[PDB]
């Protein structure tokens, strides 16, 4: 199975990884454009662990060429910006976050990005997401 949308310049699909198949109906509105978009990624799930201390492992792969591991902090534990950080294991999370992609001048045909949400506190996998961005 998979889930996708078509931009006027890119098609983004995603499905759960090959081992961590924990739920999340993630989305976006409007569908992201490779070259600049202002919008809202919409989240709706039920976390297996406390979200305070959330961060992401972003393993990108452009044109079938793996990039360096990139860690992305979402919640620090002290007065986070997003409302969801305060969310507890088992809690229902239904929120929509605003973002601002600047835009790649000359973006190439094939993109890949796998995400692992990690509970910073207990180093435990929270969910895994596998994305594909085609031009």
């Amino acid at each position: 199975q998979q889930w996708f949308c078509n931009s006027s310049d890119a098609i983004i699909s995603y499905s759960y990884c090959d081992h961590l198949k924990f739920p999340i109906s993630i989305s976006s509105e409007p569908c992201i454009r490779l070259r600049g978009t202002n919008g809202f990624v919409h989240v709706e799930f039920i976390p297996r662990g406390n979200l305070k201390y959330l961060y992401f492992n972003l393993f990108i792969s452009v044109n079938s060429i793996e990039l360096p591991k990139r860690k992305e902090v979402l919640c620090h534990g002290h007065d986070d910006d997003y409302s969801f950080c305060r969310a507890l294991k088992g809690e229902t999370v239904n929120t929509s976050i605003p973002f601002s992609f600047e835009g790649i001048l000359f973006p190439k045909g094939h993109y890949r990005c796998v995400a692992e949400a990690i509970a910073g506190d207990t180093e435990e996998k929270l969910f895994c997401l596998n994305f594909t961005i085609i031009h």
Binding site: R48, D79, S83, K89, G90, I97
Partner: protein
């Protein structure tokens, strides 16, 4: 059954399709996780046997009915987590048996009111989390007087529209009661006049409460007559936002007596709202995650004793001079500012870490305008160029340059005037020691962390000759290959020495003589064939010697040393797992060398 995370102590039965609690889990277990299981009804005398259980996770277990006497056996329980069970109605005696509880979490249990909530006999309780429910009443229940230890109450993501003089009429008759309270995400629109008149709170959290600055301004005004040690304010980046945040709203906060005022992410921010006159006589000013970009409109009458700037958006270093400012923190900064001269008479704590920050011309009175400086943190920054020698800042006793690119320190004698520094960390500042007097002047130094740098010709020079008062010294990961002669010879007071992860091939026992005070010598992970040089010479104060993961030559040439391994068995760490390095050895456990072949 489950997952044994700590034998006879902690178990993980999260998401196992279990329908009842397992039956063959020890009675010694202290922590059990049963979240995400169809438990449905928490039967009576379920956890009867678990007399040492202190923490029980039942997060999202589809629990609809807490049966009578459910908590029977759990008189030692202290953490009870019930997030996301549809147990809408709690009949009295819900929490009977939990005679030791400090923490009840009934988040998203569909909890309607606190008056029905049967917790009044929970005398041990400290924290109560009731966020994400259907609580309409900001009433603080009368049974709270009994709850003599309960000091935190969160009611976030509930529906509370009105704080009324009666809601808080309990904090009134009880001024002696220290209570923190959070009602973020409540759609508050009306606070009754003179409501907070006469009440003290330690901390109060109001985030994402206000639809309009007008609803806000008006409401904020009636907080009048309240003492708050810490009031946090602002909103979320994903919730009911403000259209315009005008400095005017804070009017009325000019009644509420405040010690610490914390601002967080606002949708619309003016670099001036922080200058506002109702913030004049505050002792502690905190900004976290603020759309602030510049800060210099700070009047000299503002009675600030501390300032905290975290995860903010400054494009140039602030430029201030508040007379009574004791502590200053500026950390985790969006962009990459650069140091900028500032005069703070009362400054005794400077915290400047984790900003892509560059500083050139460090450091002296002029740089900061005080002598009283004891703490100084400059770690996790960029290019710190060493110019002057801390001249005028003698009272400084904590210097931290971790992972920040220090420049020109091998050049001069940088720390030359720091006769009181106790703690210096220059770890992973990517440094090469040429100069011999680098640490010259640090005669009060005790702790010297300096790992992952390097040395000229990978030889350990004589930079430690004057660092007499050293007790902790860390040369781990320093690509070392050799140690020069009288290197460690003055450290008649050192307790701990780390030379792990280097390239030492042997150890000259003579080096560590004169270390009359040494307890731990870590020489793990090295290319250490053996030691040589009177094995009796090692300090008789050394108790933990670490030679793990090495490469010990079990040759006859080292007969003496191989015996030393025995005489001093108990003092080496994991001696029993040490394996030889040389000829046919693998299955050949070091402590097994004999005494024959050629010798």
């Amino acid at each position: 059954p489950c997952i044994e995370v700590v034998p006879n102590i902690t178990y993980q039965c999260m998401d196992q399709k279990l329908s009842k609690v397992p039956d063959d889990i020890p009675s010694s277990t202290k922590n059990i996780d049963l979240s995400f299981n169809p438990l449905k009804i928490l039967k009576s005398y379920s956890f009867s046997n678990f007399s040492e259980l202190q923490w029980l996770d039942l997060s999202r277990c589809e629990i609809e009915t807490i049966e009578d006497k459910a908590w029977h056996g759990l008189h030692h329980l202290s953490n009870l987590i019930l997030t996301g069970n549809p147990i809408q109605s709690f009949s009295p005696g819900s929490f009977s048996g939990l005679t030791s509880l400090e923490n009840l979490v009934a988040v998203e249990t569909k909890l309607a009111s606190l008056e029905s909530f049967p917790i009044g006999q929970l005398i041990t309780l400290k924290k109560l989390n009731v966020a994400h429910n259907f609580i309409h009443s900001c009433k603080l229940p009368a049974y709270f007087s009994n709850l003599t230890n309960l000091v935190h109450v969160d009611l976030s993501y509930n529906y509370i529209q009105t704080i009324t003089v009666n809601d808080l009429q309990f904090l009134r008759e009880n001024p002696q009661v220290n209570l923190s309270l959070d009602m973020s995400l409540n759609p508050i629109d009306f606070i009754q006049d003179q409501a907070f008149q006469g009440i003290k709170l330690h901390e109060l959290t109001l985030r994402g409460n206000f639809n309009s600055s007008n609803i806000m301004k008006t409401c904020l005004q009636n907080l009048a007559g309240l003492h708050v040690h810490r009031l946090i304010l602002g909103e979320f980046k994903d919730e009911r936002n403000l259209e315009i945040f005008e400095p005017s709203i804070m009017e009325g906060l000019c009644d509420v007596t405040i010690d610490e005022f914390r601002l967080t992410y606002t949708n619309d921010f003016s670099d001036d709202i922080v200058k506002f006159h109702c913030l004049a006589n505050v002792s502690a000013m905190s900004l976290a995650g603020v759309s602030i970009k510049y800060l210099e409109d700070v009047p000299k009458h503002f009675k600030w004793q501390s300032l905290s700037i975290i995860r903010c958006q400054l494009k140039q270093f602030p430029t201030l001079d508040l007379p009574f400012l004791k502590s200053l923190t500026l950390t985790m900064n969006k962009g990459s500012i650069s140091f900028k001269k500032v005069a703070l008479p009362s400054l005794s704590y400077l915290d400047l870490s984790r900003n892509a920050l560059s500083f050139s011309g460090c450091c002296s009175y002029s740089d900061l305008g005080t002598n009283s400086l004891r703490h100084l943190d400059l770690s996790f920054n960029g290019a710190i160029i060493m110019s002057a020698n801390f001249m005028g800042l003698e009272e400084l006793q904590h210097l931290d340059f971790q992972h920040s690119t220090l420049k020109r320190v091998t050049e001069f004698s940088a720390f030359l005037s720091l006769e009181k520094l106790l703690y210096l960390d220059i770890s992973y500042t990517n440094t090469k020691i040429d100069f011999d007097g680098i640490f010259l002047g640090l005669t009060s130094l005790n702790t010297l962390k300096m790992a992952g740098n390097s040395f000229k010709d990978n030889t350990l020079s004589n930079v430690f000759a004057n660092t007499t008062n050293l007790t902790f010294l860390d040369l781990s990961k320093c690509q070392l290959e050799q140690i020069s002669w009288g290197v460690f010879d003055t450290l008649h007071r050192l307790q701990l020495l780390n030379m792990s992860h280097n390239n030492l091939l042997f150890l000259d026992s003579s080096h560590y003589n004169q270390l009359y005070s040494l307890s731990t010598l870590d020489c793990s992970f090295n290319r250490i064939e053996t030691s040589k040089g009177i094995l009796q010479h090692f300090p008789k104060s050394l108790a933990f010697f670490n030679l793990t993961n090495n490469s010990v030559a079990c040759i006859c040439e080292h007969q003496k040393f191989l015996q030393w391994v025995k005489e001093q068995k108990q003092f080496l760490v994991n001696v029993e797992q040490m394996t030889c390095a040389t000829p046919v050895e693998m299955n050949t456990s070091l402590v097994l060398d004999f005494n024959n072949s050629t010798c």
